């Protein structure tokens, strides 16, 4: 029950360990909102761009070097990270791309906010192909004062789809005394 | 520690199971050396003593689940139940194998040290058999998917411990305890596997008058088929050669009998002549069954193929009539349900009052 | 000619000869002289219908006026060696071989149309040769004569002295007065 | 006190019409279900089980219907489903998970009333494989979905998403144990009157001592049906392990011309009712003669859609009078004859 | 259309085909109607034997008998505007009239 | 291409691609011309009883009569820089001519 | 290789076998020398396979799945021109010699 | 095993369990050897 939640933008920039290129408060809100009261792994570039500890929820910051802070989790590898999270319904990572790279192979849901602003970042979301992934909720914004640029938003869940088979039929052959 | 020896749990198991003496056997003698084992860990020997991972092969309705529910109510250590048909690949929306483990550690009350000792029951193995022929563009992400996770929990892997209970705290107490300590038994039970013994096994007839022509009641139940289970039928059933090798000792449980059938309905603590008897009581009225319609009520549900379920089939419906007008029906103290009344030729006494 | 037929299944229609289709429903046809050729036909069509289904009967036709012995001596020892029991029905004739082949069917599944004819007789042969000779194949057909009064006298339940009286010379009966011997039990006249 | 089975049976005779097993059945059920929640103390060292029925009946007999009375009455969470939706774990398709997030939306979230509920699982003769030979494909939504409901049948803890039912600021999986809960499937098992057919008759053949019925004497759908039995049902591709947890088996008869007749006018919403409905709030009156009905009646027989026939009986024989008569003037009252029904004349509209 | 669990349609878009009309007022998109066209090729190919999932005919037929009856239907929050992050919404199906529409090629020669 | 619910591919593919030459324009992309060759590759092999569901003949005839004459069609998520999944581009296919080319072999005997 | 719609793996595949012998590059691909071999047994009583290669040969673009190096970043499914591929189709045709 | 990093079992992992045995060190990992068995299971008659 893990979950990437992120705010990809055209091509995939992420740009998570540079600022935000965009800062759309209303996609800081769709994080909160589907971010609150779970647990929120994250990588140490992540936690030094936010800085102070998010409210309401067990940050778990996956750094390979010791903790340096005591108001949030600290965890030093992937597998240990997923089972700091304890026995919670849902799991997201908010993390950089190594975070997000680590996660996704084992994650069943994608809270993504697609922002059409274009800028040249240097970090990138995973390569997910569509097939396999099953919209479940889809919402479309438009430009705002406060949001630079448009931004929509989408959630989808990992469910295989069955495909039908030949059907071939069993053919009889006679045979006479000659 | 090990103060139960296998005779003691077996006359333990028998309290609640009526029958599957074999099955019990195996299942108390694995248990019993497993836990010795346990009891000292390496026990300082060179040697490394295989596992006796046990794999339930019984019909429909004979005791697997039974077994397991039993035997956890007089084990100490953390015991789990997993249903196969829940499971899916990593990655999909489906449950992971990985939460078994989690779900055996609230059992054991996050000790370590107990979770390393607990028994998963992994019931429906049988669902998960590989059965689509090279499909080459889908995923069996109920199949062959999750036979190969459980692979790995068998033949070893980290548990890391998260503190689950005790407040969540900037320390790692994950000390990696290894899986391959758990006893893993899987049931299920295989509808078809019979037919493919049968053809390996099968003696082939001919047409003249040496050949061996055998009518339908001369034949072999799947009982007896199944006790001749070999690992090769299993692949054929759509299991992976590795998987059956990690489950060494195979536990072939034996379609009940009449009077295994006329047993369940009253020796067991919480058989249906007493669970029917109870609500009756609780109208009010008493509930009499004479041993002679139990006898009837056994032939019956012999040939529903359904276990020790088809006696409620049997139960429910004589009653159905005598259950709709007596709620309303005043001046009644008992119901006498006598042979007749099973058959269908004959209505229900009661003893007014 | 025989006719062709077709029977519908599920994996599809299939063309049949009218005696081929009869087969499929356990029906085997007993028509003209007893020879080994024909015997051997009839021994492998109950041979395969009791394979397919050893618990189902079947049903064997009978309007032939007699043949060799020899070749219904096999069948007979077919029927009664086969599990599955084999009903008998005369149509038109039953003779020697007929009827003997008639009442060896299993006891409650002989059956005689109205208007049929049954004629019992006993052994004929006959040898040319030296007296030696003569004595030689005299004394085996007289004890194919006792062998087959005595299976009679089985499955009719008359006793032997009656039959050797009753089949010294042609006797024939009818339908209504096979059954009061015991070559048949019942006869047909309507569906139900 | 709690209602008896008599009480509840009236309860179903509103809306329902001539099948009196399966009302005795469902009663009992429960009434028995009733009980063993009254009885929450388990004054008894037993641990009182249930027994789900499974309603095996032809079309347009009242499957749907009954299920839907009887929650009208009910006061203990109650569900429907449909089994077409329902797939394996894993896939595109519904879970069997959902229906008990279904329950918990009606119980108001109350773990304790959800624990406690009756489901009906309606088209469960569509998930039946296509027979009991192996099936060389997964059968996402056959055998998949079969599988999936064992253990809810039997019981087991069930995790249904968080933030469910009526709580909606929640993040930790509920548990809700189905052990008490009451599945009541039902299906239309089309095509087993001829398994049933090929047991409880044999010697179907060529010959002298076969046997002949040319269909008159032929035993009916209902007929057939009510000798149902486990190994029939396998044939018809429901598993075993399926069918066990399905012990009472109650069969509907298909319903007879005059059982129709009654179904037009005494039940509660009756068809007739339904028009008149129409005709009266543009206002104008509706009646039907009593030899209608039974000509009516006729028709809907050899349609073989049950009760639906009806529907499209009545729709032909006044369509006509639907379309000129709003627009017709001083007209207070229509009647339908049995000329009409047959299309010798046009119903005669009473002027004023 | 194809049955559920399979790469093809589902017989819900026709829900939200409706809702978009709407504008996503499920009380105006309960009250709709609807027109399925080619209702002949879903025709069960009653020759062959009950040995395969007909996916594409028997299968939506099946599918379609509670939806053209009634039933409460689960289709993904997607528009514009969707207040249930994942609440997906409830529409009623006992009062949409439904049209089917064939063309039923060669039942001339069955009558 | 073959039926909807199947292991091949589906007609909606032959929109997919008009809509990569016309740089993921619906727009343009209804007005665009087609070009289905082998046409004659889908007709039933003298089949007329419809023994069973020709998945890549009849029923991909049974596909194209909506699509050629006209209907909104569900076109794949993308396979270009689309960033949604669960847009289902719908394109108008009535302002869409179809051409459609084959060999008919054996068509000279039945004229 | 069989037709489509049949469980046997499709005749795009082997451009997918091409493109990753390629090293994710088109310039190469496109001056590549596929094999393709045993052409003989899946002549006439067969015919719907040689028709798929039929086209492949003479020229089509074809797309590409985007696996394998970095997943394959284009987003257009890399599609490759196949109308500069050199088709070495061989195969031992026994009987060819009697016919002849 | 099944096709490599798509449906079913990667092969990549195999490579993988003898890393670590390796010491992660590429040079003692080219002097591996990988014991494949079971081969005659999966070759065509797909
Ligand atoms: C740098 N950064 C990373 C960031 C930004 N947007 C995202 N958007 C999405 N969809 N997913 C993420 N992974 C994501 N991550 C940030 C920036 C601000 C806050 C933040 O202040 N969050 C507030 C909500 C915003 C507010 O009200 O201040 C909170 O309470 O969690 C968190 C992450
Ligand atoms: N040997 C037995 N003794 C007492 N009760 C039994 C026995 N076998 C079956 N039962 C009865 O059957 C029910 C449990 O059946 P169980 O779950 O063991 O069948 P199963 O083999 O698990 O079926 P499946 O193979 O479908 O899972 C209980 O209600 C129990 O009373
Ligand atoms: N006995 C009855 N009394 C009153 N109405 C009935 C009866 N039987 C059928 N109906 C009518 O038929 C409809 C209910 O159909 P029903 O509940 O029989 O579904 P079903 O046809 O059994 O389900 P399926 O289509 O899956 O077989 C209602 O509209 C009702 O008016
Ligand atoms: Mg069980
Ligand atoms: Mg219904």
């Known amino acids: ?178 | 520690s090990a103060l139960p020896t296998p005779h003691e749990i077996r006359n333990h198991l028998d309290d609640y199971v009526i029958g599957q003496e074999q099955a019990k056997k195996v299942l108390a003698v694995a248990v019993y050396n497993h836990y010795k084992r346990l009891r000292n860990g390496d026990t300082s020997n060179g040697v490394e003593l295989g596992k006796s991972n046990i794999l339930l092969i019984g019909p429909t309705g004979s005791g697997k689940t039974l077994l397991a529910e039993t035997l956890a109510r007089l084990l100490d250590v953390p015991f789990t139940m997993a249903d196969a048909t829940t499971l899916t690949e990593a990655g999909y929306v489906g449950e992971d194998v990985e939460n078994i483990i989690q779900k055996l550690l609230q059992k054991s009350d996050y000790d370590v040290q107990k979770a390393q000792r607990g028994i998963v029951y992994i019931d429906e193995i049988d669902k998960i058999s590989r059965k689509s022929d090279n499909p080459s563009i889908t995923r069996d992400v109920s199949g062959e998917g999750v036979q190969q996770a459980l692979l790995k929990l068998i033949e070893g892997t980290v548990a890391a411990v998260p503190p689950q209970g005790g407040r969540k705290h900037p320390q790692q107490e994950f000390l990696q305890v290894d899986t391959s300590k758990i006893l893993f038994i899987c049931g299920g039970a295989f509808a078809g596997l019979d037919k493919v013994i049968s053809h390996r096994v099968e003696t082939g007839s001919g047409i003249g008058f040496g050949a061996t022509v055998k009518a339908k009641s001369d034949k072999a139940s799947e009982g007896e088929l199944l006790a001749q289970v070999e690992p090769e039928d299993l692949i054929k059933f759509g299991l992976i050669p590795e998987f059956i090798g990690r489950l060494p000792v195979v536990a072939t449980l034996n379609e009940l009998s009449e009077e295994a059938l006329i047993q369940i309905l009253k020796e067991p603590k919480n058989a249906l002549t007493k669970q029917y008897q109870a609500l009756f009581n609780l109208e009010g009225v008493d509930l009499e069954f004479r041993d002679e319609a139990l006898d009837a009520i056994a032939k019956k549900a012999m040939a529903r193929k359904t276990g020790a379920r088809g006696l409620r089939s049997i139960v429910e419906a004589a009653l159905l009539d005598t259950m709709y007008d007596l709620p309303s029906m005043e001046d009644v103290e008992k119901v006498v349900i006598d042979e007749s009344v099973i058959d269908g030729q004959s209505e229900p006494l009661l003893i007014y009052g | 000619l025989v006719p062709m037929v077709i029977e519908q299944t599920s994996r599809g229609e299939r063309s049949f000869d009218i005696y081929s289709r009869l087969l499929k429903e356990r029906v085997i046809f007993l028509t003209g002289q007893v020879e080994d050729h024909m015997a051997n036909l009839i021994v492998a069509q109950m041979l395969f219908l009791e394979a397919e289904n050893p618990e189902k009967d079947i049903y064997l036709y009978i309007n032939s006026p007699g043949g060799v012995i020899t070749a219904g001596m096999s069948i007979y020892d077919t029927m009664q060696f086969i599990k599955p029991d084999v009903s008998t029905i005369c149509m038109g004739q039953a003779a020697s071989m007929g009827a003997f082949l008639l009442t060896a069917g299993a006891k409650g599944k002989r059956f005689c149309l109205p208007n049929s004819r049954v004629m019992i007789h006993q052994p004929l042969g006959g040898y040319q040769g030296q007296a030696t000779d003569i004595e030689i194949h005299a004394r085996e057909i007289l004890k194919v004569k006792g062998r087959m009064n005595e299976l009679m006298a089985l499955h009719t339940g008359q006793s032997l002295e009656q039959i050797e009286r009753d089949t010294e010379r042609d006797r024939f009966l009818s339908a209504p007065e096979a059954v009061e011997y015991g070559l048949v039990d019942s006869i047909l006249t309507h569906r139900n």
């Open chain 1, 1 to 178: 029950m893990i979950s990437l939640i992120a705010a990809l933008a055209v091509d995939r920039v992420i740009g998570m360990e540079n600022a935000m290129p965009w800062n759309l408060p209303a996609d800081l809100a769709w994080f909160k909102r589907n971010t609150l009261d779970k647990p929120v792994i994250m990588g140490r570039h992540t936690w030094e761009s936010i800085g102070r500890p998010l409210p309401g929820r067990k940050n778990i910051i996956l750094s390979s070097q010791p903790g340096t802070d005591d108001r949030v989790t600290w965890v030093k590898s992937v597998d240990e990270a997923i089972a700091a999270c304890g026995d919670v319904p849902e799991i997201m990572v908010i993390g950089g791309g190594r975070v997000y790279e680590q996660f996704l192979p084992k994650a069943q849901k994608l809270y993504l906010t697609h922002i059409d602003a274009e800028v040249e970042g240097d970090t990138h979301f995973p390569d997910y192909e569509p097939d396999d992934w099953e919209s479940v909720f889809s919402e479309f914004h438009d430009a705002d004062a406060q949001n630079s640029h448009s931004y929509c938003f989408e959630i989808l869940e990992r469910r295989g789809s069955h495909l039908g088979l030949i059907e071939v039929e069993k053919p009889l052959y006679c045979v006479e005394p000659f």
